[PDB]
Amino acid sequence: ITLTFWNLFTGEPAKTKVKEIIDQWNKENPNVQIVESVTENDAYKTKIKAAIAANEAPDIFQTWAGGFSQPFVEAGKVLQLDSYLNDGTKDQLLPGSFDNVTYNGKIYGIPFDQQASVLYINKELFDKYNVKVPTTFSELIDAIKTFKSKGVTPFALGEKDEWPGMWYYDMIALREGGVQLTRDALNGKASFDNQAFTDAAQKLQDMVNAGAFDSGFMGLTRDEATAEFNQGKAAMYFGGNFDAAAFVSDPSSLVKGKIEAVRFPTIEGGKGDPTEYIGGTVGALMVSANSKYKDEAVRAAKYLAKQLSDMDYLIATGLPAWKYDNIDQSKVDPLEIQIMNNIVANAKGSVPAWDIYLSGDAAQTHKDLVAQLFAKQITPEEYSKQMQQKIN
Ligand SMILES: O[C@@H]1[C@@H](O)[C@H](O[C@@H]2CO[C@@H](O[C@@H]3CO[C@H](O)[C@H](O)[C@H]3O)[C@H](O)[C@H]2O)OC[C@H]1O
Numbered sequence: 001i002t003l004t005f006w007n008l009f010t011g012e013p014a015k016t017k018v019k020e021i022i023d024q025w026n027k028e029n030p031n032v033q034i035v036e037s038v039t040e041n042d043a044y045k046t047k048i049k050a051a052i053a054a055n056e057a058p059d060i061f062q063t064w065a066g067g068f069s070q071p072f073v074e075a076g077k078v079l080q081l082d083s084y085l086n087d088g089t090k091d092q093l094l095p096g097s098f099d100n101v102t103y104n105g106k107i108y109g110i111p112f113d114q115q116a117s118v119l120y121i122n123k124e125l126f127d128k129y130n131v132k133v134p135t136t137f138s139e140l141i142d143a144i145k146t147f148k149s150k151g152v153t154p155f156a157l158g159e160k161d162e163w164p165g166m167w168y169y170d171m172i173a174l175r176e177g178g179v180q181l182t183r184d185a186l187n188g189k190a191s192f193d194n195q196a197f198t199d200a201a202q203k204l205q206d207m208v209n210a211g212a213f214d215s216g217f218m219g220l221t222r223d224e225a226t227a228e229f230n231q232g233k234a235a236m237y238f239g240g241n242f243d244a245a246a247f248v249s250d251p252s253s254l255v256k257g258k259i260e261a262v263r264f265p266t267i268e269g270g271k272g273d274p275t276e277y278i279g280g281t282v283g284a285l286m287v288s289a290n291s292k293y294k295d296e297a298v299r300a301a302k303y304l305a306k307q308l309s310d311m312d313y314l315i316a317t318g319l320p321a322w323k324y325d326n327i328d329q330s331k332v333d334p335l336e337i338q339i340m341n342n343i344v345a346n347a348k349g350s351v352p353a354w355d356i357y358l359s360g361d362a363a364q365t366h367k368d369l370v371a372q373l374f375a376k377q378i379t380p381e382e383y384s385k386q387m388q389q390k391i392n
Pocket residue numbers: 008009010011012013014015041042163240242243245283317318353354355356
């Protein structure tokens with residue numbers, strides 16, 4: 001039997017590590033082989049949605065739990081997994097790992113990773129100019145102005161694919177409004193046309209106007225921006241913890257041991273708790289409802305998920321969802337540990353990035369309207385009117 005598996009781990013060392021994880025399975029399972037097809041993140045979203053709709057999805061596929069996957073589950077395209085989870089598997093994952101892969105009270109995925117929002121600081125550049133790490137949004141705007149004045153790009157941001165810049169908006173909205181107001185809006189219990197979301201839009205444009213980003217940032221991908229930051233060409237980078245690898249594990253990086261992870265700053269008058277973050281347990285593997293080899297495919301998905309989780313922890317491409325007592329802490333990068341310590345530990349609450357929590361057209365609307373904010377092609381007030389009108 002040969003199972004197909006799709007994932008998005010395109011960069012090094014993840015691409016090599018995933019291949020190794022698959023090679024090990026294949027050596028230990030002569031009669032159940034896996035073959036993988038690997039597609040860059042943003043093209044993978046297109047690929048997996050089309051495949052699921054056309055009933056040509058692989059046996060096992062990587063996904064984002066929550067809103068992203070909800071249509072696949074509602075269409076009957078995803079194998080329910082409850083009957084395969086009475087074997088002790090649950091106790092091998094961290095508490096609460098399954099919540100986002102549970103729909104209508106039933107489990108449709110095997111979690112493997114958690115996301116968390118991280119402000120990354122180039123300590124070398126901060127020390128060079130004697131800039132303190134900013135802890136408030138006022139301090140952050142002052143730091144942006146200080147770096148800009150020295151000819152140093154304050155933030156490396158690649159906004160072409162829209163979701164990386166959206167992280168900035170969703171965090172600022174979380175600091176302005178708090179987690180409950182974000183959830184209510186995303187769940188349709190509050191209009192998007194609310195002063196906290198408009199204030200967030202203004203603060204995002206305050207970053208642009210202060211010269212936080214390089215002139216051509218709308219033209220750059222995430223990968224191009226992580227290359228900018230790992231070459232030491234920007235003071236700060238903000239986004240997912242998954243980007244950490246580009247800085248401490250990518251062999252091209254010039255900033256290993258120079259990068260610190262901190263929480264996004266507080267905003268004066270904001271209603272959000274300073275420890276709230278954008279993220280949650282949202283990396284999962286799912287099995288296709290139409291797989292010819294359901295039992296083998298779930299066995300393989302259990303194995304893949306644990307190995308991806310351990311890999312994520314070791315190379316800092318993600319925060320593990322599986323317990324990691326088998327892993328030796330001295331082999332883990334200090335930045336990954338720091339993400340756990342500075343962002344995740346003792347956090348009051350969290351919410352996934354809005355394009356994983358929303359689905360389809362609504363997620364796309366938010367990504368495109370945020371991209372207009374960055375481009376100064378919309379006012380904060382019209383942003384919030386249009387969000388309400390286009391979504392609801
Ligand atoms: O829509 C956004 C998603 O696209 C985003 O997904 C993460 C993209 O980054 C992946 O990280 C990989 C780690 O290492 C490799 O070398 C790859 O090239 C990277 O793509 C994460 O695994 C995905 O979770 O999540 C947030 C969402 O807003």
